[PDB]
Amino acid sequence: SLFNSEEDVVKMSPLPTVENQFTPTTAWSTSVGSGIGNFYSNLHPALADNVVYAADRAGLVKALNADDGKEIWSVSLAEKDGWFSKEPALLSGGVTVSGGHVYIGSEKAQVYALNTSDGTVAWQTKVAGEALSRPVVSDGLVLIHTSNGQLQALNEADGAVKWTVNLDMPSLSLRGESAPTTAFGAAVVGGDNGRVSAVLMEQGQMIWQQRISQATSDVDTTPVVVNGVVFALAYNGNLTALDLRSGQIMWKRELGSVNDFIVDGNRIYLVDQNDRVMALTIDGGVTLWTQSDLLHRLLTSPVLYNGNLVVGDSEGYLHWINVEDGRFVAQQKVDSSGFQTEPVAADGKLLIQAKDGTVYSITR
């Protein structure tokens, strides 16, 4: 391809000049070892009962006071196998917190449950594949969607596998975030070679299955359930709405190349593969706005916080976007190792973890 080769397609001058309409600040930051470095990861902080739990790839896990960032505990899941030199745990999926346990998945097909109290290992279970998605907890069970297309349910108390459902044999879904979603005692799992499935939580019985993509970059295929509708993103950029009750397709938009989406009220917020942001009406029918100034800056998934859509980028900036017209309302240089994993909005807090592992609490 002579023409593509002869172009210096290069360089961007992103960093739109934004006149900040408020002053976003760091309430606190706390280091977490070396973070994920240059490895791709879905590891992000979790917040519960005023405690932020965060981890790094090597195996460090910290419990921090949500108000000041002070360490409540810290343990390492890195292990030394007899005579052999200590090895990183390669934590990848999580963190997730639920009823006294911190659940984390690993690239070594390990799932760990830690006690929120003191950080001691409640249990550890060998899982059917790499756990690169966040564990999802529902009625006594820890749902793990592995990278090799398996959906396993573990007993939250002892980690024993209750059931396994082979959803597809790839491999190995390019570590797109593909956690299950829950609703009415069911799990809805996407990803999987273009199919969305709903299975019963009890014994993993297939309730319905719907092809949203023709069979065949890291797309977040986690379905989002909202008032009886399932919003699912296929790997090929198709956004689809499905009736939760029956799995019947309501509508479909061939967006071509979407990395992430969230849904909220009457809007769907999308970030495309090239870091363009867009908002659509709930039915995906009308384009409300687009924002093109962040092209190629490699954005995190967006989060809705304090009325704004917030995304971080690889250069270490946070950008705050008016959800009405997609204009920037604030821009902030936070950490120069950059952002990659999702920002988290919980109980009034905005947490985000840089690549070097430093966790920030950001106030708007």
Side-chain angles (χ1 to χ4, degrees), residues 1-2 4-8 12-78 80-167 169-170 176-192 194-201 203-216 218-363:
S1 349
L2 260 324
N4 171 283
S5 299
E6 301 312 304
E7 322 160 348
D8 308 40
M12 316 138 334
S13 338
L15 215 46
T17 58
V18 186
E19 199 95 41
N20 288 10
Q21 301 182 10
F22 59 81
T23 302
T25 70
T26 296
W28 51 266
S29 76
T30 299
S31 52
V32 182
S34 59
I36 67 183
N38 273 330
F39 296 95
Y40 173 82
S41 176
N42 302 136
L43 205 56
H44 52 81
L47 172 100
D49 292 27
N50 213 43
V51 182
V52 179
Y53 303 92
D56 69 23
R57 189 167 184 266
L60 181 64
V61 186
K62 282 189 187 187
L64 313 173
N65 186 294
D67 285 328
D68 60 13
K70 253 67 95 71
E71 191 180 303
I72 299 170
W73 52 256
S74 62
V75 59
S76 171
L77 305 192
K80 186 174 190 316
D81 288 18
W83 174 82
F84 296 84
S85 59
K86 173 194 293 296
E87 292 288 347
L90 302 177
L91 308 179
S92 50
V95 175
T96 288
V97 192
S98 177
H101 289 332
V102 177
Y103 302 102
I104 309 149
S106 88
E107 305 162 38
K108 294 188 185 180
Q110 292 302 312
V111 172
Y112 309 78
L114 273 37
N115 301 116
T116 52
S117 56
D118 57 25
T120 54
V121 178
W123 52 260
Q124 168 177 353
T125 292
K126 159 67 157 304
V127 131
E130 296 188 6
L132 315 170
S133 295
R134 94 192 53 191
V136 176
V137 174
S138 175
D139 23 277
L141 298 176
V142 181
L143 298 169
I144 310 290
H145 189 208
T146 60
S147 58
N148 60 332
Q150 242 80 20
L151 174 57
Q152 285 179 304
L154 314 195
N155 186 293
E156 84 180 3
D158 58 26
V161 178
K162 178 170 175 46
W163 53 255
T164 298
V165 180
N166 196 132
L167 292 173
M169 301 270 71
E177 181 78 28
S178 197
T181 299
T182 67
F184 306 97
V188 184
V189 184
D192 296 333
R195 295 191 280 182
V196 172
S197 297
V199 307
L200 217 49
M201 214 69 124
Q203 199 61 230
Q205 305 100 317
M206 194 76 55
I207 306 174
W208 54 255
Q209 187 189 48
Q210 184 59 239
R211 179 155 300 275
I212 68 170
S213 166
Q214 307 84 29
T216 199
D218 306 284
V219 190
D220 187 336
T221 47
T222 292
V224 178
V225 167
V226 173
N227 315 133
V229 190
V230 177
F231 303 88
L233 236 199
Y235 65 100
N236 72 348
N238 293 359
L239 182 64
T240 297
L242 304 170
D243 175 307
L244 175 65
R245 224 180 192 96
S246 68
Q248 288 174 6
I249 303 185
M250 298 174 68
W251 52 261
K252 181 185 196 47
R253 312 294 165 189
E254 301 182 41
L255 299 183
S257 64
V258 179
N259 264 338
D260 300 308
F261 78 102
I262 63 181
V263 186
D264 203 280
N266 291 148
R267 286 191 200 94
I268 294 172
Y269 306 100
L270 313 150
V271 194
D272 83 10
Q273 173 181 293
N274 289 342
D275 304 293
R276 187 161 202 257
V277 191
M278 279 187 82
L280 306 185
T281 50
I282 196 71
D283 52 1
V286 154
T287 295
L288 295 181
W289 53 257
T290 66
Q291 171 54 254
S292 303
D293 287 339
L294 303 188
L295 227 54
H296 300 305
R297 296 176 62 85
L298 304 162
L299 312 173
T300 64
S301 61
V303 76
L304 220 173
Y305 184 64
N306 207 35
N308 301 117
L309 198 74
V310 177
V311 289
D313 63 28
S314 60
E315 295 89 352
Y317 287 86
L318 281 183
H319 311 268
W320 308 63
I321 296 169
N322 188 328
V323 301
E324 276 309 306
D325 60 6
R327 303 199 199 289
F328 297 118
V329 303
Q331 173 173 293
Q332 184 192 5
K333 171 52 147 297
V334 183
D335 186 308
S336 49
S337 72
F339 298 101
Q340 200 260 100
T341 61
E342 83 178 29
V344 185
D347 308 336
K349 310 268 185 178
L350 181 54
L351 306 173
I352 186 168
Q353 184 169 27
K355 293 187 183 180
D356 65 19
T358 300
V359 177
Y360 296 83
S361 178
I362 314 304
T363 60

